Amino acid sequence: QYNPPPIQLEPLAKFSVDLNAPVWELGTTSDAGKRRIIPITGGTFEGKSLKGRILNNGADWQIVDSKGLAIIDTRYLLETDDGALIYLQTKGYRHGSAETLKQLAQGKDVDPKNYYFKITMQFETSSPKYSWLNQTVAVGSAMRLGKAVIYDAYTLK
Ligand SMILES: [Cl-]
Ligand SMILES: [Cl-]
Ligand SMILES: [Cl-]
Ligand SMILES: [Cl-]
Ligand SMILES: [Cl-]
């Protein structure tokens, strides 16, 4: 039978992104919401097959709407432990979790507030060791921690 194969998520690496620069708050640049340019200054990643650091390059070019949805749109740059460069783009959404927003709507003090923060990932490299990532779909589960984002990256197998 013709069912497509089952989906498995294979751990890629744990990312720790540093945002150690002031945010450029451009205000409401269209009906879509507030434009925020959030510099990416460095960080690290650590997984079985992929390890290294994030360089000082790029940003999240974010839009925050009137309902507290953030739309993520990034460009940044990885340097593996063995010296390969990998251009990364992430896209996705950050918003209050359904339960957190329900509690707030009832006047119930929520501690801590929880968020839906999920991304898709696109890679570009010329290194033969890492070029599989040029043609593999990948996703992340993220969390803000002050001027940092931590996320677990997975490939679709
Ligand atoms: Cl930059
Ligand atoms: Cl949710
Ligand atoms: Cl979060
Ligand atoms: Cl963010
Ligand atoms: Cl902070």
Side-chain angles (χ1 to χ4, degrees):
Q1 268 218 124
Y2 303 159
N3 287 25
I7 196 156
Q8 305 292 347
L9 298 177
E10 181 179 19
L12 180 60
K14 179 175 194 148
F15 285 71
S16 305
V17 189
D18 285 336
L19 311 175
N20 294 159
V23 177
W24 285 291
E25 301 283 2
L26 273 66
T28 302
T29 62
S30 76
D31 281 8
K34 293 181 191 169
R35 173 66 69 181
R36 310 182 69 232
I37 303 173
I38 306 162
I40 293 164
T41 60
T44 60
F45 50 98
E46 183 78 0
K48 185 178 184 181
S49 79
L50 185 66
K51 299 176 176 68
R53 71 185 180 136
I54 296 163
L55 301 182
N56 187 357
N57 171 74
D60 183 4
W61 286 263
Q62 188 176 89
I63 300 162
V64 182
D65 80 5
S66 66
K67 299 142 170 80
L69 174 63
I71 306 174
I72 307 307
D73 191 305
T74 72
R75 298 184 181 180
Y76 57 118
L77 184 61
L78 314 182
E79 181 186 39
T80 67
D81 61 352
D82 54 351
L85 298 170
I86 313 171
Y87 163 43
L88 177 58
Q89 296 163 268
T90 72
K91 292 176 174 70
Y93 303 115
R94 182 172 186 260
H95 62 78
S97 73
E99 180 59 18
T100 286
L101 299 174
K102 180 192 171 273
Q103 289 172 307
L104 292 174
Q106 302 183 311
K108 297 177 177 164
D109 190 18
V110 182
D111 275 336
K113 296 176 63 167
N114 296 126
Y115 294 80
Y116 183 91
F117 186 7
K118 309 298 207 270
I119 57 170
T120 63
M121 305 175 71
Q122 181 177 354
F123 306 92
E124 280 191 32
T125 186
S126 67
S127 166
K129 183 168 172 189
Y130 306 101
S131 62
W132 70 285
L133 298 170
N134 293 336
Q135 58 175 33
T136 303
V137 172
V139 297
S141 178
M143 184 183 294
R144 267 191 155 176
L145 188 71
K147 291 178 202 299
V149 173
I150 310 297
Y151 68 87
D152 294 332
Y154 306 81
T155 57
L156 278 65
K157 201 181 183 175

Short mmCIF file of all heavy atoms in Angstrom, two decimals, residues 12-18 43-47 50 52-54 76 78 86 88 90 119 121 123 133 139-143 148-154:
data_model
loop_
_atom_site.label_atom_id
_atom_site.label_comp_id
_atom_site.label_asym_id
_atom_site.label_seq_id
_atom_site.Cartn_x
_atom_site.Cartn_y
_atom_site.Cartn_z
N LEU A 12 19.48 16.53 16.12
CA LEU A 12 20.60 17.11 15.39
C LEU A 12 21.62 17.74 16.36
O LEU A 12 22.80 17.33 16.43
CB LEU A 12 20.08 18.14 14.35
CG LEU A 12 21.22 18.81 13.54
CD1 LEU A 12 22.05 17.79 12.74
CD2 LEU A 12 20.64 19.86 12.61
N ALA A 13 21.18 18.77 17.07
CA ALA A 13 21.99 19.44 18.10
C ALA A 13 21.15 20.35 18.96
O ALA A 13 20.07 20.80 18.54
CB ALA A 13 23.13 20.30 17.41
N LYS A 14 21.66 20.63 20.15
CA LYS A 14 21.12 21.67 21.04
C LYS A 14 21.86 22.97 20.77
O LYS A 14 23.08 23.03 20.83
CB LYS A 14 21.26 21.29 22.51
CG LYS A 14 20.72 22.40 23.46
CD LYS A 14 20.75 21.92 24.94
CE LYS A 14 19.94 22.82 25.86
NZ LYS A 14 19.35 22.04 27.00
N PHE A 15 21.09 23.99 20.39
CA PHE A 15 21.57 25.34 20.09
C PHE A 15 21.32 26.29 21.25
O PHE A 15 20.21 26.30 21.85
CB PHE A 15 20.86 25.91 18.85
CG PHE A 15 21.32 25.33 17.52
CD1 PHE A 15 21.00 24.01 17.15
CD2 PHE A 15 22.08 26.09 16.62
CE1 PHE A 15 21.41 23.47 15.92
CE2 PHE A 15 22.50 25.54 15.38
CZ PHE A 15 22.18 24.22 15.06
N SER A 16 22.30 27.14 21.48
CA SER A 16 22.23 28.21 22.46
C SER A 16 22.64 29.50 21.73
O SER A 16 23.81 29.67 21.43
CB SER A 16 23.12 27.86 23.68
OG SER A 16 22.75 26.58 24.22
N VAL A 17 21.68 30.35 21.40
CA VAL A 17 21.91 31.56 20.61
C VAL A 17 22.01 32.77 21.55
O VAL A 17 21.12 33.01 22.40
CB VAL A 17 20.77 31.81 19.57
CG1 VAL A 17 21.17 32.96 18.64
CG2 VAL A 17 20.45 30.51 18.75
N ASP A 18 23.08 33.52 21.38
CA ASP A 18 23.32 34.75 22.18
C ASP A 18 22.78 35.96 21.39
O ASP A 18 23.06 36.11 20.19
CB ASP A 18 24.81 34.94 22.43
CG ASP A 18 25.36 34.00 23.48
OD1 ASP A 18 24.59 33.53 24.32
OD2 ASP A 18 26.59 33.71 23.48
N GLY A 43 27.04 32.24 20.05
CA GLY A 43 26.40 31.10 20.66
C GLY A 43 27.09 29.81 20.30
O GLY A 43 28.22 29.81 19.83
N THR A 44 26.44 28.70 20.64
CA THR A 44 27.03 27.36 20.48
C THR A 44 26.00 26.38 19.99
O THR A 44 24.76 26.61 20.10
CB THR A 44 27.60 26.82 21.83
OG1 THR A 44 26.55 26.72 22.79
CG2 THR A 44 28.75 27.70 22.32
N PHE A 45 26.47 25.25 19.46
CA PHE A 45 25.60 24.09 19.22
C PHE A 45 26.36 22.80 19.50
O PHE A 45 27.58 22.72 19.28
CB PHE A 45 25.01 24.09 17.79
CG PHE A 45 26.04 24.28 16.69
CD1 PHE A 45 26.56 23.18 15.99
CD2 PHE A 45 26.42 25.56 16.29
CE1 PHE A 45 27.51 23.36 14.98
CE2 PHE A 45 27.38 25.74 15.30
CZ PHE A 45 27.89 24.63 14.61
N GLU A 46 25.63 21.81 20.01
CA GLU A 46 26.23 20.55 20.45
C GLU A 46 25.29 19.38 20.20
O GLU A 46 24.20 19.30 20.77
CB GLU A 46 26.57 20.63 21.94
CG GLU A 46 27.29 19.36 22.52
CD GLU A 46 28.77 19.27 22.17
OE1 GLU A 46 29.28 20.18 21.48
OE2 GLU A 46 29.43 18.26 22.59
N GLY A 47 25.70 18.49 19.28
CA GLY A 47 24.99 17.24 18.99
C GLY A 47 25.95 16.14 18.61
O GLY A 47 27.15 16.38 18.47
N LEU A 50 27.13 17.07 14.93
CA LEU A 50 27.22 18.52 14.62
C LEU A 50 27.51 19.33 15.88
O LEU A 50 26.71 19.36 16.82
CB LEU A 50 25.89 18.99 14.02
CG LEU A 50 25.86 20.44 13.52
CD1 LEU A 50 26.77 20.67 12.31
CD2 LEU A 50 24.43 20.91 13.21
N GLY A 52 29.86 23.02 17.32
CA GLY A 52 30.57 24.25 16.98
C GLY A 52 30.02 25.50 17.63
O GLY A 52 29.40 25.44 18.70
N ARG A 53 30.26 26.63 16.98
CA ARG A 53 29.86 27.94 17.50
C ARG A 53 29.12 28.77 16.44
O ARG A 53 29.24 28.53 15.21
CB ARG A 53 31.05 28.74 18.05
CG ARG A 53 32.02 29.27 17.03
CD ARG A 53 33.21 29.94 17.72
NE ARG A 53 34.16 30.45 16.72
CZ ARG A 53 34.76 31.63 16.74
NH1 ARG A 53 34.65 32.43 17.79
NH2 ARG A 53 35.57 31.96 15.72
N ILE A 54 28.32 29.70 16.93
CA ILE A 54 27.64 30.67 16.12
C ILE A 54 28.52 31.90 16.06
O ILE A 54 28.99 32.39 17.08
CB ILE A 54 26.22 31.00 16.71
CG1 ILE A 54 25.35 29.74 16.68
CG2 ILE A 54 25.54 32.16 16.00
CD1 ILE A 54 24.12 29.82 17.57
N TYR A 76 21.75 33.68 9.98
CA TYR A 76 22.97 33.65 10.76
C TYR A 76 23.92 32.59 10.28
O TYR A 76 23.71 31.98 9.20
CB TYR A 76 22.68 33.62 12.25
CG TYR A 76 21.81 32.53 12.88
CD1 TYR A 76 22.36 31.67 13.84
CD2 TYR A 76 20.43 32.49 12.70
CE1 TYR A 76 21.58 30.78 14.54
CE2 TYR A 76 19.63 31.59 13.40
CZ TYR A 76 20.22 30.77 14.38
OH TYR A 76 19.45 29.92 15.15
N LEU A 78 27.03 29.51 11.15
CA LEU A 78 27.64 28.49 12.02
C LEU A 78 29.07 28.20 11.57
O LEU A 78 29.34 28.12 10.34
CB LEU A 78 26.84 27.19 11.96
CG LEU A 78 25.31 27.30 12.07
CD1 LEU A 78 24.68 25.93 12.05
CD2 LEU A 78 24.91 28.10 13.32
N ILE A 86 28.43 27.07 7.76
CA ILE A 86 27.06 26.71 7.41
C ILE A 86 26.12 27.90 7.61
O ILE A 86 26.00 28.41 8.73
CB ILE A 86 26.52 25.49 8.21
CG1 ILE A 86 27.52 24.31 8.26
CG2 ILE A 86 25.09 25.11 7.74
CD1 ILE A 86 27.14 23.20 9.20
N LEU A 88 22.64 29.49 8.02
CA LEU A 88 21.37 29.02 8.57
C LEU A 88 20.30 30.12 8.43
O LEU A 88 20.54 31.30 8.79
CB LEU A 88 21.59 28.63 10.07
CG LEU A 88 20.34 28.18 10.86
CD1 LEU A 88 19.68 26.99 10.23
CD2 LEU A 88 20.71 27.89 12.33
N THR A 90 16.19 30.45 9.85
CA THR A 90 15.07 29.88 10.59
C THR A 90 13.83 30.78 10.40
O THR A 90 13.92 32.00 10.20
CB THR A 90 15.36 29.68 12.10
OG1 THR A 90 15.41 30.96 12.76
CG2 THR A 90 16.70 28.95 12.33
N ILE A 119 10.20 26.40 15.25
CA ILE A 119 10.81 26.89 14.03
C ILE A 119 11.06 25.78 12.99
O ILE A 119 11.17 24.59 13.34
CB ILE A 119 12.17 27.60 14.32
CG1 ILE A 119 13.15 26.67 15.07
CG2 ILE A 119 11.93 28.87 15.13
CD1 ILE A 119 14.58 27.21 15.17
N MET A 121 14.03 25.08 9.79
CA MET A 121 15.44 25.39 9.59
C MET A 121 15.87 25.02 8.16
O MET A 121 15.57 23.93 7.69
CB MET A 121 16.30 24.58 10.60
CG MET A 121 15.91 24.77 12.05
SD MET A 121 16.89 23.64 13.27
CE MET A 121 18.65 24.42 13.22
N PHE A 123 19.53 25.02 5.76
CA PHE A 123 21.00 25.07 5.80
C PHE A 123 21.64 25.21 4.43
O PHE A 123 21.15 24.63 3.46
CB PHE A 123 21.54 23.80 6.41
CG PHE A 123 20.96 23.44 7.76
CD1 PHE A 123 19.83 22.61 7.86
CD2 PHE A 123 21.59 23.86 8.95
CE1 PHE A 123 19.35 22.21 9.13
CE2 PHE A 123 21.10 23.48 10.20
CZ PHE A 123 19.95 22.67 10.29
N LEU A 133 22.75 18.31 5.04
CA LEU A 133 21.82 19.29 5.57
C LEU A 133 21.24 20.24 4.52
O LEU A 133 20.16 20.81 4.75
CB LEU A 133 22.48 20.10 6.68
CG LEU A 133 22.91 19.33 7.94
CD1 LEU A 133 23.77 20.23 8.84
CD2 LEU A 133 21.67 18.84 8.64
N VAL A 139 13.53 21.01 11.99
CA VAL A 139 12.68 21.79 12.87
C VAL A 139 13.31 21.95 14.25
O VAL A 139 14.24 21.24 14.61
CB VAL A 139 11.28 21.15 13.05
CG1 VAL A 139 10.56 21.10 11.70
CG2 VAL A 139 11.38 19.75 13.65
N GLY A 140 12.86 22.94 14.98
CA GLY A 140 13.33 23.22 16.33
C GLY A 140 12.24 23.53 17.32
O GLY A 140 11.20 24.09 16.96
N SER A 141 12.48 23.18 18.58
CA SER A 141 11.62 23.53 19.72
C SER A 141 12.42 24.43 20.63
O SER A 141 13.49 24.03 21.11
CB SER A 141 11.20 22.28 20.47
OG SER A 141 10.40 22.59 21.59
N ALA A 142 11.96 25.65 20.79
CA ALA A 142 12.75 26.76 21.37
C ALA A 142 12.16 27.34 22.66
O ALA A 142 10.95 27.20 22.93
CB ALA A 142 12.88 27.89 20.32
N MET A 143 13.00 28.05 23.39
CA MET A 143 12.61 28.81 24.56
C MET A 143 13.49 30.07 24.71
O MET A 143 14.73 30.01 24.57
CB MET A 143 12.69 27.92 25.80
CG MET A 143 12.21 28.57 27.09
SD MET A 143 12.44 27.46 28.61
CE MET A 143 11.16 26.06 28.10
N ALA A 148 18.78 35.56 25.08
CA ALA A 148 19.24 34.27 24.51
C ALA A 148 18.03 33.46 24.11
O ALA A 148 16.92 33.66 24.61
CB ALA A 148 20.06 33.48 25.55
N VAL A 149 18.21 32.60 23.12
CA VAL A 149 17.24 31.57 22.75
C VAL A 149 17.96 30.20 22.77
O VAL A 149 19.05 30.04 22.20
CB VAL A 149 16.65 31.81 21.34
CG1 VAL A 149 15.76 30.63 20.90
CG2 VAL A 149 15.86 33.10 21.33
N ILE A 150 17.36 29.26 23.47
CA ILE A 150 17.83 27.87 23.53
C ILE A 150 16.84 27.02 22.73
O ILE A 150 15.62 27.15 22.92
CB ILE A 150 17.79 27.31 24.99
CG1 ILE A 150 18.48 28.27 25.97
CG2 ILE A 150 18.40 25.89 25.05
CD1 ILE A 150 19.92 28.48 25.71
N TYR A 151 17.33 26.15 21.86
CA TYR A 151 16.43 25.24 21.15
C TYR A 151 17.05 23.90 20.81
O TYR A 151 18.28 23.78 20.65
CB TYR A 151 15.85 25.91 19.89
CG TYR A 151 16.80 26.24 18.71
CD1 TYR A 151 17.08 25.27 17.70
CD2 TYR A 151 17.29 27.51 18.54
CE1 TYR A 151 17.83 25.57 16.57
CE2 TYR A 151 18.04 27.84 17.43
CZ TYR A 151 18.30 26.87 16.43
OH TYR A 151 19.06 27.23 15.33
N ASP A 152 16.22 22.89 20.79
CA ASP A 152 16.58 21.55 20.35
C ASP A 152 16.23 21.40 18.85
O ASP A 152 15.06 21.59 18.47
CB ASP A 152 15.82 20.48 21.14
CG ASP A 152 16.18 20.44 22.61
OD1 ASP A 152 17.32 20.79 22.98
OD2 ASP A 152 15.32 20.04 23.41
N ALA A 153 17.23 21.16 18.03
CA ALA A 153 17.07 20.93 16.59
C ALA A 153 16.97 19.45 16.26
O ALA A 153 17.69 18.63 16.85
CB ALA A 153 18.22 21.54 15.84
N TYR A 154 16.10 19.14 15.30
CA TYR A 154 15.86 17.78 14.78
C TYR A 154 15.80 17.80 13.26
O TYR A 154 15.27 18.75 12.67
CB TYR A 154 14.52 17.22 15.29
CG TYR A 154 14.34 17.24 16.80
CD1 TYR A 154 13.96 18.41 17.48
CD2 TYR A 154 14.54 16.07 17.57
CE1 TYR A 154 13.81 18.42 18.84
CE2 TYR A 154 14.38 16.09 18.94
CZ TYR A 154 14.00 17.25 19.57
OH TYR A 154 13.82 17.25 20.93
#
